[PDB]
Structure 1
Amino acid sequence: PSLPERIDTFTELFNYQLAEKSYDIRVLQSNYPTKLLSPDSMLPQTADYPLKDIQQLYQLANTCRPLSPLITEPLVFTRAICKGTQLTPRWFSRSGLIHPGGGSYAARYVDKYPELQDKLAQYMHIKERKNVQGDELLASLKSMNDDAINALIAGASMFIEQNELWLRRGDHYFVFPKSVWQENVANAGLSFKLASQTKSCFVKRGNICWDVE
């Protein structure tokens, strides 16, 4: 019984009608563009532009007083802020979402116009958003460390989120507590460490490095 065979056995020992939570990946995809989930989005994107471009961008942002086509959309946004031009939710929805300095256009816009928070929150990076009562998915996403959220972005078959197992079945993730998954690990004859806990990760699924028990 190979390791990938034991992993298949492991996934078949769960009762998916008994998961504590489940999320439709297609609904997740509709509500959360990848750019609003990726940890990299919150870091400066400025390396993806020739210096002469960003030179135009911060001169414009800092003084409100450029040629490259690649900088068109950041220019439109910067000019809009400088001038008081209204940017609608549809504008944000059709934009690249992420500002060259890191973070979202929408979070910067709401900084200038705080009353727009609720209308524009869906165009902000999850790391910029506040949790909302009853929005369990947004809470689940915000609490994921980088390895976990990156496994989810990749559509990984499984990953560990703190002490809970997220298990993909079809187009859904089903979430199980340690009481359930640690038994199924043992019953499949497996053991694992997280990718952040070991250097040797020969059989990897999401952030899980599998081995025999």
Structure 2
Amino acid sequence: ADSLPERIDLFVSLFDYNSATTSYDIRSIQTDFPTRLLTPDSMLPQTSEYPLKDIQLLYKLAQSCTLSPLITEPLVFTRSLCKGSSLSPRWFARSGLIHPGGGTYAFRYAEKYPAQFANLLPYMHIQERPNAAEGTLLYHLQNMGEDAINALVSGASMFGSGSDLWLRKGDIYYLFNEETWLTNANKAGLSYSLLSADNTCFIQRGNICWDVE
């Protein structure tokens, strides 16, 4: 197992970057996609960011339409929706993007004002945008699980999503299909699997890898 780092280096050396399925500049991804609009936790009620009773207070208000400083901006949003007052794309660009109840301000607003949808897409979570065309960047992002999104955001040297290997060289991710990945792992004398969070198979029982959650 001491040869492992050297085998992984050999593995990477086997790839022909010119024959990658596609490639994406990390800078282009960062330009187009706020991390806040990638991470799956943004889609959930923001319980780690607010006391629950404040989130509940906002729902009550939005349903009733008739107040701590943790929620100043959510309150501005809520009142605007209640009053039928308009919010320009500039308001969303200035905003924290994520509504305390989960998802974005832009998506909620555009549901009420569908004519403003196109201009507000840049401020919506990838999971809130329409299903992307196959093979596009947004498609790849929409189909990534949490661990893959985290790896991408971390600028990891490599990660797997959905039988695609994403390989980083310089500032560019090159995508290779599962067959190529497996072929090169085989040649390097390597086995691989995808594991979640920091699950390192700390203890093994039979064929089951266990870790603490």
Q: What is the number of residues matched between the two proteins?
A: 200
CA deviations 1:36-90 (Å, max 9, x no partner) are 1101111100342235533542232121112x22211101111111112211112
Question: Hey, what does 2:211 align to over in structure 1?
Answer: none
**SS state at 2:191 partner:** strand
Amino acid at match of 1:21: T
For the pair 1:17 / 2:18, whether they are aligned, the reply is yes
Percent of aligned pairs with the same amino acid: 60
Q: Distance in 2 between matches of 1:47 and 1:58?
A: 17
Partner of 1:6: 7
Question: Which residues of 2 match residues 78-89 of structure 1 at below 5 A?
Answer: 78-89=78-89
User: How far apart, CA to CA, are the structure 1 residues paired with 2:18 and 2:188?
Assistant: 20
Which residue is equivalent to 2:206? none
d(CA) in 2 for partners of 1:110, 1:44: 19
**How much does 1:199 deviate?**
5.6
Which residue number corresponds to residue 181 of structure 2?
A: 181
Can you give the 5+ residue segments of structure 1 that lack an aligned partner in the other structure? Answer: 203-213
Report the CA distance between 1:201 and its aligned residue: 4.5
- Corresponding residue number in structure 1 for 2:116: 116
Q: Does 1:97 align with 2:97?
A: yes
The root-mean-square deviation of aligned C-alpha atoms, in Å, is 2.1
Select the structure that is richer in helix. 1
The corresponding residue for 1:59 is 60
Q: Secondary structure of 1:126's partner?
A: coil
Say which is worse superposed, 51-60 or 70-79, in terms of deviation.
51-60
- Normalization by structure 2: what TM-score? 0.86
Deviation at 1:130, TM superposition (A): 0.6
Greater shift, 142-151 or 112-121, is seen at 142-151
Code of the aligned partner of 1:33: P
Inter-partner Cα distance in structure 2 for 1:192 and 1:133? 30
* Structure 1 residues 201 and 171, CA gap change in structure 2 (3 angstroms): farther
Q: Which residue of 1 aligns with 2:160?
A: 160
Residue segments in structure 2 that go unaligned for 5+ positions in a row: 203-213
> CA-to-partner distance for each residue in 1:117-173, whole Å, 9 max, x for gaps?
111111111111013558811111111122222221222211112211111111111
In 1, distance between residues paired with 2:73 and 2:28? Answer: 28
Structure 2: how far apart are the matches of 1:7 and 1:61? 54
* Cα distance in structure 2, aligned partners of 1:58 and 1:141: 30
| 8 Å CA contact 1:59, 1:65 repeated in 2 | no
In 2 relative to 1, CA 39–55 (structure 1 residues): closer, same or farther, beyond 3 Å?
closer
In structure 2, how many angstroms separate the alpha carbons of the residues matched to 1:144 and 1:136? 13
Partner secondary structure for residue 27 of structure 2? helix
